[PDB]
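Data availability (excerpt). All sequences and predicted token strings are deposited with the supplementary files. A representative entry, Methionine aminopeptidase 1, is shown inline so that the format can be inspected without opening the archive.
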Amino acid sequence: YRYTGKLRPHYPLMPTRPVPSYIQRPDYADHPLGMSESEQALKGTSQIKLLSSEDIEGMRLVCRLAREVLDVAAGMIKPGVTTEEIDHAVHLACIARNCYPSPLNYYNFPKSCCTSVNEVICHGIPDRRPLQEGDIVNVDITLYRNGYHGDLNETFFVGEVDDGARKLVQTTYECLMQAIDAVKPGVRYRELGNIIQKHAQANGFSVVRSYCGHGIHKLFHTAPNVPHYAKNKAVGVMKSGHVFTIEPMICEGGWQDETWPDGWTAVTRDGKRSAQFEHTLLVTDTGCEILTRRLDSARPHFMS
Ligand SMILES: Cc1nc(-c2ccccn2)nc(N2CCN(CCO)CC2)c1Cl
Ligand SMILES: [Co+2]
Ligand SMILES: [Co+2]
Ligand SMILES: [Co+2]
Ligand SMILES: [K+]
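Structure token line:
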């Protein structure tokens, strides 16, 4: 394997972290290959769940808890902290909230959150590498509570970063918020990618194509598939009661990705930097409710 940039994995990984039996587990938690049979039973279906009030309460709770866990991770970002250490804090924070860390053993993913440094687009596996001053790093958190998953991510600065890093992260955040502003009943899922790419392109950035936003509720990833690039073939129209994510991955250079030998880590083929932000959204009548929003501060961590 020829690496695309300066990043390398730092092994060994500490042994898989257990989750006390008292915490309710998703179907895939105990599957030998971490396959989710409830998800697989809906593979290739484009029909979107309309959530009940019970479902909405469940989503509101789990998404609030997920935000709390992301905030825990935010507090730990500093030079010299390893991504495994962030993951350990995340793991314990989920457990403290009587939640299962959704990524853990999801299709055999070995950790409890994804840590995506610099050229890693998404699905970076927490390991022994200490964060370095100048790095940018995304932590993507998902929690499972009472049958419901809640999912968000933010990109962070490690110490002082360069102008390019600031522009990339700022622009990525803007793409997400411009797409969210457009969410309301009657809007086609395929429109969001038009908005996101318009803004990314205007700032000299490209939009990752291989990874998309997604339905989430009783399943971790489900209909609708939500591309972040222009002129996509996404199936569906937003309706009150739909829950899904928007999670644009944006790059300094080209949009092409490839995966490391670990089967997870997705990196820019050109080794330039990528950034991502993500919210879980509920479509209402005036627009939408940002379920994973901060409740106690106006802005994402990188501005604050
Ligand atoms: C966006 C996405 N993320 C993950 C993931 C996985 C591990 C940790 C964090 N995220 N998985 C996704 N999948 C994985 C397997 N799928 C079924 C095909 O085998 C599609 C949903 C998808 Cl579609
Ligand atoms: Co993912
Ligand atoms: Co996520
Ligand atoms: Co997501
Ligand atoms: K990154």
